[PDB]
Amino acid sequence: SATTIQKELENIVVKERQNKKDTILMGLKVEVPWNYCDWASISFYDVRLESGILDMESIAVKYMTGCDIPPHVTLGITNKDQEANFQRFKELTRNIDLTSLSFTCKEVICFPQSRASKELGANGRAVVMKLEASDDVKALRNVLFNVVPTPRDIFGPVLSDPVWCPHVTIGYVRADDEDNKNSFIELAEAFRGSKIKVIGWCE
Ligand SMILES: Nc1ncnc2c1ncn2[C@@H]1O[C@@H](CO)[C@@H](OP(=O)(O)S)[C@H]1O
Numbered sequence: 001s002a003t004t005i006q007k008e009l010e011n012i013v014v015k016e017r018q019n020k021k022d023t024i025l026m027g028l029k030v031e032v033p034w035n036y037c038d039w040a041s042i043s044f045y046d047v048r049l050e051s052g053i054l055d056m057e058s059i060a061v062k063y064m065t066g067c068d069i070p071p072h073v074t075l076g077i078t079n080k081d082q083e084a085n086f087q088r089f090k091e092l093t094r095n096i097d098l099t100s101l102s103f104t105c106k107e108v109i110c111f112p113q114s115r116a117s118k119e120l121g122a123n124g125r126a127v128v129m130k131l132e133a134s135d136d137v138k139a140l141r142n143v144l145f146n147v148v149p150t151p152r153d154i155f156g157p158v159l160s161d162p163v164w165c166p167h168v169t170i171g172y173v174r175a176d177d178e179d180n181k182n183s184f185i186e187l188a189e190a191f192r193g194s195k196i197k198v199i200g201w202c203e
């Protein structure tokens with residue numbers, strides 16, 4: 001059970017996310033086997049079409065744009081002042097062939113609604129394809145965090161240790177329409193077992 005301090009620390013984590021703007025994405029641009037038309041029967045949640053969003057610039061809702069998402073696997077998100085360190089890391093890894101890296105689609109997961117987005121007026125949940133990452137990807141991410149200071153992930157209770165869930169987000173849907181959510185998951189489940197190829201760094 002969480003303590004008083006832990007509960008207070010969670011509020012700080014959520015607010016920190018809400019306050020975050022202008023961060024940089026350290027991720028791998030990938031090619032996926034699914035297309036928009038595969039989800040033609042699905043209704044997506046796009047904050048750009050919604051009202052009551054209290055801060056469109058917050059990274060907690062800014063990227064909740066239906067299925068209009070560039071296919072990518074996030075390694076980490078950090079502050080803009082780390083841009084130089086990240087650029088230096090890309091140069092340090094210039095000899096690494098990122099296109100040799102591969103992920104395997106395992107299971108379709110609908111992440112829980114982030115409290116940071118909900119408090120900013122969002123009503124969406126992310127449907128993602130959980131990926132199996134090779135040791136090369138895991139090592140690449142660890143060394144990235146060694147060269148480029150990156151906020152520690154805290155997706156759960158503040159006391160828990162983060163378990164990286166490599167994933168390619170497919171689309172956001174309303175958190176209050178189960179039929180739509182389940183139909184989406186079913187359709188996305190058809191792509192399980194597919195292999196995703198890395199093209200390079202997200203730019
Ligand atoms: N400059 C940026 N700063 C923070 N996030 C950014 C971003 N550009 C893209 N995103 C995407 O927004 C994330 C949600 O925070 C992730 O999406 P995801 O992997 O699909 S759950 C992330 O990739």
Ligand SMILES: Nc1nc2[nH]cnc2c(=O)[nH]1
Pocket residue numbers: 111112155163164165166
């Ligand atoms: N990597 C990762 N992202 C998440 N987003 C929401 N929950 C999680 C989680 O457990 N892991």
